[PDB]
Design a protein around this ligand. Structure first.
Ligand SMILES: [Mg+2]
Ligand SMILES: [Mg+2]
Length: 1935
């Protein structure tokens, strides 16, 4: 802990810097808690025996915390910077440091007593506000300033600091602060808004009165006696001891008698016995299943319900060809005659008109579609057959068709038609999009994607998707008797006949093909057999439910993803064509089958095989037992596929149960030998198996309404209802050894709460309840009623909807929540804390919760959703916030602290290594819970919450929780309808009143419920309870480990991580001998196994889906930590990467398409696969835009080709390398600098839309969506009539829009009255995209509508935007870097990325296979904790209304506002005037426009190989696994000697002497090299061929003087230059011109000219330096001369409309000629700490051609050691200076008192003041040194939480005593691990040189001086006031 290394870490560039704030937290074990003895008395305070002063104790909180930092002499602001006289010259910093490179560093520390990011961010912002302006003022008047600013803020939780540190110093600081804050508080300003909110909430809580008596009445078991008796009485001890002993002996006996530890068999015998038992169990299951079924041996049927046809698509057309013959369409008749009649009727005249036009479906020209009805009179036989149309299978069925289908099948062979209509229509758009990056990489990847699209599988899937879209469209028409509809598929010779229904739940269709254009077939045999008709081939009226439609639409964009992902995972090159590996056909075929055949209970087997395969990772003491998965596999079978899957699964189980997975740690790493695919016979590595358990995964939110799934849901909801204990005794009143299905022991709950509370109170400092209460009161008291969770779901279920058939033949139609806030705002309420006072009473007058149900269709996941009513949400939101607040400050929970998801597992390894010695062994168990819902009686939650509250909340929480013990649930009306015509057979009887059941009333349309928490509602209380339980488990395990089985003590650390349901335990030990390892492994095995039996006490039932006692692997949520290797299932997000999403505006879909891609990249995928996924995403986005439905797609394609702007349908594709890295904003930025888009945006910002009040003004109305901006024609869409009608029912005058423009002040301040609240509601109801139309139909049709409607409407007619071509001609009525930066607030990072990206334009690399696993890094891209910048909207609120939403300051506020004005032309400082000039029509469009103009991309946690890392490394490695992508020593010593001479104490003449001699002796490479900084070096070295062109070319900086002003003589002898001159120059290829003028006291800048504008922000400071050289002020104004880009005052940016300062008028041909300078007047110069090569252009006026300043990262030591071994350099205190190492200190002891030297003067005294550096290694404070006797923190220990001692069961003790176990024979076999040399667990985790050199350049100056200062004294020198002999050293020091 020293300041020198810390300040040496940071490197700064010229100017002022603030860096980036970073957040460090607690990782290692907290030290501290010493003997604390605080006694306040007269002399102050006392601690231990050291006494501190009282008023010093008033500030010890900061002095002690930073004792090792402030050791300087307390300089001032004036002493370092030039005087500004602005009052701030007396601003005293906390540490002002100036290292030997002039890099000024001002740092101030702070300490807050908060507990979250809130106080941290607050302190950071207030420190920045305190110290912003003076330092900027001082840096504005310096020559070459390099000043850094840093802030340090600490808290008991974490530390926020912009200067990089190491976790050790963070831990030191945090624990020091803990001690300091403790002694501070034992020894003993907010704003106004929060000060009002706290009182507003406290008043309500103090006067809140819930009717506890009516509550006890209307609710079963709500009694305050339970709560008070739980809080008051302590916890029993003897009961717990006997219960633990009983549970322990029971678990031990169960383990022994379940894993065959009796009596003596070896491992192989136990394994064969296990194999026999598994065989028996599978045999029994098969027999019991086959016994109840129609026993068959062959079932002729199919699996794919569609016929295999592969036509060659012809020219596109939507019309039925007529000339077909009929010579054979009457062979069969009953189907052929139907098609014959159809063709004959459509031929001549029988068709009719049915228009299905987009504008209808959204419920609002030639875009209208034409469909044909039908009425063909069929014969009686065929009519009867059609009216006729429209048992569980056996495990032994000989399903071999599926078998040999997955072996040989033409599924991946190339369909020879790869250049046809559809492929052209896609590839053209693809090439147009990719034209931005025309490298070889992009061409290769596009060719690979097209080759993939050419395979016959996607060719078959394409027309299937077309058919599915057409059917979804035709789903809801009008049905005539005997009607039909004939349609063509617009790309293929296929015809479909459709017969819709009225139920709108399925459909009937029949296909037909010409039988002469069927080119190929999929040559399978699981396919629906068609029929022959001569020259035709037809189908037989299948039926497809409406639920199984989206999966048919999304078929190509999942087949492509599967093909690409599996082709890459196998290890094939994405740019090298090969054959199908015959191990790849299986995976693709299986994906195809599981996708097409879409049911539950079929993919469920595959998603369940994981828990079966998750065995074999079990440790020798136990055996792999997959037989626990029998059950959940029973039930009926209804497909030929389920039988095959079940047989293969059972075979995999019996294969696994015979031998586990091997475990061989060859080198220091560990692996696992034998793995294999689940449904196959294979052998693949881990990563190939892990994400094979996720074959049939997908997501949706469509709200399926099939009666079957809804019935299963209703069944699941009521399962444990009848299991009520029927006794209000064991539900929170007394203890119980064996608890029943819903009971829980109270004393154990109290013990767990006490344990967790002690852990919390030890991590944070005590007296924490107060901080929590204030935090909760604040966070509640600020919730306005308007900013609620609008657009959510509510329930219109009241008492009236309780009698079926009395309210039926109606629709429920659940509604939104906005209506509630509307009808509340009407009633005069503003704050959320006001509505609850009546919402609670309104609820209590009822007797239920009025819950409604909701179910999506995703076959698995989080399917159920329980929507509530507003009166319940309003009371639940006030309690869930308290729950989340109490949960946020826990050390285990991972749903409020999300980052801990990836910290408590990795870092554990380091922890294990810390207090164990390297070489430990892990023992892990990943648990779960069986029924996390329907098993938690809601009283335990209330108790465990009220235990953590300050008692001002007890009554409110008790009431608001007591509302969950009688809830009513709605049901579908169609459900009861069809039901009133097994479990369902009981439900119908309960409904009809025959059989009495205890939930459903007779005749009533609901379901009662008394037990079970709802899912999603009480999300955090469950996590809190689980945290308590897991903390108790951790304490108990630490206890049992503290004392061995026989009085010994095994050593080991425990870790506990847990979220909502899933949880893990990660114990780790270290043995020494061989036998002790065995004993400890057995002990920890029993310990970990006891959890299953210890769980039921807390009302938690562990399932059979949890592994136990695995050696070197865990699994928390979905990621598997296989030792130092982390595996994540990437198929999950890949499959769920293209979800249909209904948003009312374009350019908002690509946002989500990029979000999902970024999520997939996070999940982990080489960029070469992310790019293909993006191509498939583009294909999906275009197919969902009318690619195969509307016939007018050619016109839209032609329009988009000539207009690449998004929001019109165009899709932007990222760079091949670094594809999904940065979000959509990056692609937008990159496209806005190369395409015509840069033009279309420029017009939006540089047009004053007056236009003489023409008919071309405003152009596209400003309207931003998401991050992008577009025309208001799109964002205005959507029905809102219900909402505005409701508003008109209230006091909303129609003038409101106009009435808003008269006073915009109501759009930024919150509220003052009721009326402006209504105005804010009205603006809320129109802007973002809030909808009101009911989802009365499907999604795909109405999405295609919402697309094509807007597209067409913009293409031809108006809205107020113009046509496409009209706007294109309005163009002829791009961006400059200023506005480009103001738009994208992260342009610099984008530029860095792009620069690093413009080197991989070729395909060059090697296939080097590295070691087993390159342990990667944890790289984070652009990402900050909170923020530092002011948003582009707050400046307007401040300038326009005076609200200091930002706190910059008058100078800085003016500067940034002026920059903003210079960014937007029309923008003025008048809120009313800015409407009649800028593109807008109302003063509301601008409010929405400005709040989303600037947007930043999202963060990315990408992994990269180490070297610690960079982005170039990641791009080298991560492009493809197993593949990389790629394209002196005198310079170092020269840099070192240059830095040591320039900054060294010398004289300028002597400096130049030594420099030129060093240049003479040394050599250098020629300048035909890389030019970053050595260019200048080799130039100034070769200045001793022809230098003129050397400086001219190769990016120099020079320029003559074309027009000298004049010469004039001031009588004080001054050569002044007066008049008007013209200077010219050529710096970094600009050829600028500078007109200058001055006639009074000095000169001033007149005008500047530039030939280009790329490098603008650097030319500005270059011109600043040039004027500083030639000495010209830049303060006075000028007379504007032309149409300038911008103007500049004080080297600052000013707009052109202001005409304030010198204007920079860029003219490409402004000035093109050079000055032809003479090469003889060239000199070298050496200023203090500055090297220059210059030329005198005029008499007394010089010009610096080139400059140099040495960095601090070039102070070498090898070069120093070499220079030491040299004598010829007569150049070398100097000897001990350059070469760090008769005497030196003896002569200069008195040389400072009398100046007698021929060398440096003051510089030597400034340098030698560094004795404080060597004095920094010692001489600390007293309390800072006496308190180093602290021992580490031992642990939590249940003898403390329970306050008593506890004995334990010595079963294993007496067993090993008698010898009934023979442990040494159980583990014989499997390898030994105590002596195995392995690396520690965990995967993830210039300081070196800078620290070394900063600690190094001290000794070589004060070696013997330190010895003298130690010899003279060692104890009194620690004090500074005590000395106030060795007058020479003190003089050297100071004074
Ligand atoms: Mg598992
Ligand atoms: Mg788990």
């Amino acid at each position: 802990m020293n300041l020198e290394v810390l300040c040496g870490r940071i490197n700064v560039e010229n100017g002022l810097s603030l860096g980036e704030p970073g957040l460090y937290d607690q990782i290692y074990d907290r030290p501290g808690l010493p003997d604390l003895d605080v006694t306040v008395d007269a002399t102050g305070v006392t601690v231990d025996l050291i006494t501190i002063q009282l008023s010093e104790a008033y500030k010890i909180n900061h002095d002690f915390t930073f004792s090792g930092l402030s050791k300087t002499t307390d300089r001032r602001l004036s002493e370092v910077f030039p005087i500004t006289h602005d009052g701030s010259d007396g601003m005293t910093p906390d540490v002002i440091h100036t290292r030997l490179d002039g890099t000024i560093v001002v740092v101030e520390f702070t300490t807050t007593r908060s507990h979250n990011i809130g106080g941290l961010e607050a302190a950071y912002r207030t420190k920045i506000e305190k110290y912003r302006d003076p330092i900027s003022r001082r840096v504005d008047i310096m020559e070459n300033p390099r000043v850094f600013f840093g802030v340090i803020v600490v808290s008991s939780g974490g530390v926020l600091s912009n200067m990089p540190l190491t976790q050790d110093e963070a831990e030191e600081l945090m624990y020091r602060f803990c001690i300091a804050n403790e002694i501070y508080t034992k020894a003993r300003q907010k704003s106004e808004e929060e000060l009002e909110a706290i009182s507003r909430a406290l008043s309500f809580f103090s006067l809140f009165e819930p009717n506890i008596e009516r509550v006890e009445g209307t609710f079963p078991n709500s009694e305050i006696e339970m709560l008070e008796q739980f809080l008051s009485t302590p916890a029993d001890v003897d009961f717990i001891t006997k219960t633990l002993k009983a549970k322990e002996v029971e678990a031990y006996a169960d383990l022994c008698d379940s894993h065959y530890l009796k009596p003596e068999k070896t491992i192989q015998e136990r394994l064969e016995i296990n194999r026999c038992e598994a065989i028996d169990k599978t045999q029994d299951l098969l027999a019991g299943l086959h016994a109840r079924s129609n026993k068959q041996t062959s079932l002729n049927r199919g699996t794919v319900k569609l016929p295999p046809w592969l036509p060659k698509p012809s020219s596109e057309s939507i019309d039925i060809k007529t000339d077909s013959g009929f010579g054979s369409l009457m062979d069969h008749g009953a189907y052929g005659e139907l098609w014959a009649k159809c063709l004959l009727d459509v031929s001549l005249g029988n068709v009719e008109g049915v228009v299905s036009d987009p504008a209808k479906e959204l419920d609002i020209k030639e875009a209208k579609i034409t469909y044909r009805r039908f009425k063909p009179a069929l014969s009686s036989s065929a009519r009867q057959e059609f009216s006729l149309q429209g048992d569980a299978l056996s495990p032994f069925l000989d399903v071999e068709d599926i078998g040999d289908f997955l072996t040989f099948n033409n599924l991946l062979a190339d369909s020879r038609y790869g250049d046809e209509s559809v492929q052209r229509a896609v590839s053209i758009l693809l090439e147009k999009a990719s034209a931005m990056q025309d490298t070889e990489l992009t061409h290769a990847l596009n060719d690979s994607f097209k080759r993939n699209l050419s395979s016959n599988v996607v060719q078959w899937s394409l027309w299937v998707s077309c058919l599915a879209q057409e059917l979804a469209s035709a789903l809801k028409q009008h049905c005539r008797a005997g009607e039909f509809i004939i349609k063509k598929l617009k790309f293929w010779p296929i015809y479909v006949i459709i017969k819709p229904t009225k139920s709108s739940s399925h459909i009937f269709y029949s296909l037909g093909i010409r039988k002469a254009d069927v080119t190929r077939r999929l040559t399978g045999r699981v396919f629906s057999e068609t029929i022959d008709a001569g020259e035709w081939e037809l189908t037989e009226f299948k039926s497809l439910k409406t639920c199984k439609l989206t999966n048919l639409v999304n078929l190509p964009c999942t087949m492509l993803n599967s093909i690409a992902f599996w082709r890459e995972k196998l290890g094939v090159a994405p740019w090298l064509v090969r054959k199908p590996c015959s191990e790849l056909r299986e995976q693709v075929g299986l994906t195809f089958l599981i996708s097409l055949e879409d049911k539950s209970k079929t993919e469920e087997i595959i998603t369940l095989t994981r828990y079966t395969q998750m065995e074999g990772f079990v440790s020798p003491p136990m055996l792999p037992k997959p037989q626990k998965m029998l059950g959940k596999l029973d039930g009926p079978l209804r497909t030929k596929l389920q039988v095959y899957l079940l047989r293969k699964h059972l075979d995999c189980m019996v294969r696994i149960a015979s031998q586990p997975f091997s475990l061989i740690p060859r080198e220091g790493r560990v692996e696992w030998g034998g793995t294999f695919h689940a449904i196959s016979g294979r052998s693949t590595n881990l990563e190939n198996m892990v994400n094979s358990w996720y074959i049939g995964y997908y997501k949706n939110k469509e709200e399926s309404t099939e009666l079957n799934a809804l019935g299963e849901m209703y069944k699941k909801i009521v399962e444990m209802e009848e299991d009520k204990p029927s006794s209000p005794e064991f539900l929170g009143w007394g203890d119980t050894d064996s608890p029943k299905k819903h009971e829980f022991s109270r004393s154990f709950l109290r013990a767990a709460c006490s344990s967790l509370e002690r852990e919390i109170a030890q991590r944070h400092g005590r007296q924490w309840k107060q901080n929590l209460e204030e935090r909760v009161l604040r966070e509640i008291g600020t919730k306005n009623i308007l900013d609620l969770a609008s657009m959510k779901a509510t329930s219109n279920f009241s008492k009236d909807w309780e009698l079926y058939s009395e309210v039926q033949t109606k629709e429920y139609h659940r509604s939104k929540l906005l209506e509630k806030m509307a009808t509340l705002i009407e009633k005069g309420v503003m704050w959320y804390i006001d509505a609850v006072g009546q919402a609670w009473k309104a609820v209590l007058d009822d007797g239920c919760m009025r819950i409604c149900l909701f179910k999506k269709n995703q076959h698995g996941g989080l399917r159920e959703i329980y929507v509530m009513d507003a009166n319940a949400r309003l009371v639940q939101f006030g309690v869930e916030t308290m729950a989340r607040c109490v949960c946020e400050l826990s050390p285990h929970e991972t749903v409020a602290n999300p980052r801990l998801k990836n910290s408590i597992i990795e870092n554990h390894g380091l922890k294990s290594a810390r207090s164990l010695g390297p070489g430990s062994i892990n023992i892990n168990s990943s648990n779960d819970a069986k029924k996390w819902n329907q098993g938690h009686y809601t009283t335990k939650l209330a108790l465990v919450l009220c235990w953590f509250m300050p008692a001002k909340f007890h009554r409110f929480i008790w009431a608001a929780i007591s509302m969950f013990r009688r809830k009513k649930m709605m049901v579908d009306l169609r459900f009861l309808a069809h039901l009133s015509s097994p479990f369902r057979e009981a439900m119908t009887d309960a409904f009809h009143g025959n059989r009495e059941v205890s939930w459903m009333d007779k005749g009533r349309t609901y379901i009662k419920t008394e037990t079970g928490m709802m899912q999603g509602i009480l999300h955090f209380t469950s996590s809190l309870l689980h945290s308590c339980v897991q903390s108790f488990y951790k304490s108990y395990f630490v206890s049992k480990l503290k004392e061995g089985y026989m009085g010994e003590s095994i050593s080991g650390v425990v870790d506990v991580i847990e979220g909502s349901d899933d949880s893990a335990i990660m114990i780790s030990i270290r043995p020494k001998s061989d036998m002790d390892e065995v004993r400890s492994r057995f002990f920890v095995a029993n310990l970990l196994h006891s959890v299953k039996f210890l769980n039921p006490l807390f009302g938690i039932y562990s399932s059979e889906k949890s592994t136990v006692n695995t050696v070197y692997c865990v699994e928390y949520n979905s990621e598997f930590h296989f030792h130092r290797h982390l595996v994540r299932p990437t198929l999950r997000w890949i499959a769920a990467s293209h979800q249909i999403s209904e948003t009312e505006a374009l350019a908002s879909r690509q946002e989500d398409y990029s979000n999902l891609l970024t999520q997939c990249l996070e999940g982990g995928a080489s960029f070469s696969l992310t790019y293909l996924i993006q191509c498939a995403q583009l294909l999906h986005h275009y197919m969902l835009l009318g690619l195969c439905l509307h016939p007018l797609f050619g016109t839209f394609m032609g329009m988009l080709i000539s207009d690449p702007d998004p929001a019109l349908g165009f899709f932007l594709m990222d760079n091949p390398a670094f594809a999904g890295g940065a979000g959509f904003r990056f692609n937008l930025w990159r496209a806005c600098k190369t395409t015509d888009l840069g033009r279309k945006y420029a017009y939006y910002f540089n047009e004053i839309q007056g236009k003489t009040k023409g008919d071309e003004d405003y152009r596209a109305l400003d309207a931003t969506s998401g991050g992008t901006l577009s025309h208001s024609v799109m964002v205005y869409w959507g029905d809102r009539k219900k909402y505005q009608a409701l508003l008109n029912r209230m006091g909303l005058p129609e003038d409101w829009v106009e009435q808003i423009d008269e006073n915009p002040g109501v759009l930024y301040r919150r509220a003052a009255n009721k009326k402006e609240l209504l105005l804010k509601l009205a603006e809320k109801v129109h802007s973002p995209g809030v909808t009101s139309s009911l989802s009365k139909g499907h999604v795909v049709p109405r999405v295609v509508a919402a697309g094509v409607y807007l597209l067409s409407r913009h293409c031809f007619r108006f809205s107020s935007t113009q046509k496409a071509s009209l706007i294109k001609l309005l163009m002829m009525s791009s961006l400059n870097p200023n506005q480009e930066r103001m738009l994208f607030p992260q342009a610099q990072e984008y530029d860095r990325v792009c620069t690093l990206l413009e080197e991989v334009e070729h395909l060059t690399g090697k296939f080097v296979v590295r070691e087993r696993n390159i342990v990667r890094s944890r790289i984070d891209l652009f990402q900050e904790p909170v923020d530092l910048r002011c948003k582009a909207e707050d400046l307007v609120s401040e300038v326009w209304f005076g609200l200091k939403r930002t706190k910059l300051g008058p100078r800085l506020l003016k500067e940034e506002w002026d920059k903003l004005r210079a960014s937007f032309a029309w923008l003025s400082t008048d809120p009313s005037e800015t409407l009649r000039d800028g593109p807008f029509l109302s003063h509301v469009q601008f409010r929405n426009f400005i709040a989303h103009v600037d947007a930043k991309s999202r963060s990315v946690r990408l992994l990269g190989a180490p070297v610690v890392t960079t982005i170039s490394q990641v791009v080298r490695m991560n492009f493809f696994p197993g593949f990389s992508l790629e394209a002196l020593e005198s310079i170092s010593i020269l840099k070192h000697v240059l830095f040591m001479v320039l900054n060294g104490p010398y004289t300028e003449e002597y400096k130049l002497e030594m420099i030129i001699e060093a240049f003479s002796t040394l050599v250098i490479p020629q300048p035909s090299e890389v030019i970053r900084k050595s260019r200048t070096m080799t130039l100034c070295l070769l200045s001793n061929s022809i230098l003129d062109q050397i400086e001219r070319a190769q990016s120099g900086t020079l320029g003559g003087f074309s027009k000298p002003q004049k010469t004039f003589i001031r009588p004080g002898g001054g050569v002044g230059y007066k008049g008007k001159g013209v200077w010219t120059g050529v710096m970094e290829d600009t050829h600028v011109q500078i007109l200058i003028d001055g006639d009074g006291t000095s000169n001033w800048l007149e005008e500047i000219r530039l030939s280009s504008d790329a490098r603008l922000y650097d030319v500005i400071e270059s011109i600043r330096r040039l004027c500083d050289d030639l000495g010209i002020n830049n303060r006075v104004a000028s007379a504007y001369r032309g149409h300038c880009m911008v103007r500049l005052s004080g080297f600052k940016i000013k707009p052109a409309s202001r005409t304030d300062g010198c204007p920079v008028r860029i003219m490409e041909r402004g000035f093109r000629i050079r000055e032809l300078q003479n090469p003889d007047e060239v000199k070298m110069r050496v200023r203090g700490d500055i090297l220059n090569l210059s030329v005198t252009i005029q008499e007394g006026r010089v010009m610096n051609i080139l400059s140099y300043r040495p960095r601090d990262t070039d102070i070498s030591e090898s070069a120093a050691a070499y220079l030491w071994s040299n004598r010829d350099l007569f150049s070398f205190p100097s000897c001990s200076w350059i070469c760090l190492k008769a005497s030196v200190l003896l002569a200069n002891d008195r040389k400072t008192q009398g100046i007698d030297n021929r060398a440096m003067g003051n510089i030597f005294r400034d340098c030698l003041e560094g004795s404080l550096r060597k004095q920094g290694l010692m001489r600390s404070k007293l309390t800072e040194m006496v308190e180093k006797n602290v021992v580490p923190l031992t642990t939590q220990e249940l003898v403390d939480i329970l306050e008593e001692d506890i004995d334990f069961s010595d079963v294993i003790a007496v067993e090993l005593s008698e010898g009934s176990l023979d442990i040494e024979s159980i583990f014989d076999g499997a390898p030994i691990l105590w002596s195995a040399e392995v690396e520690e667990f965990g995967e993830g985790v210039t300081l070196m040189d800078q620290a070394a050199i900063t600690m190094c350049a001290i000794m070589g100056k004060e070696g013997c001086r330190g010895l003298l200062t130690e010899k003279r004294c060692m104890a009194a020198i620690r004090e500074q006031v005590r000395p106030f002999e060795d007058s020479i050293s003190w003089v050297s020091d100071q004074f």
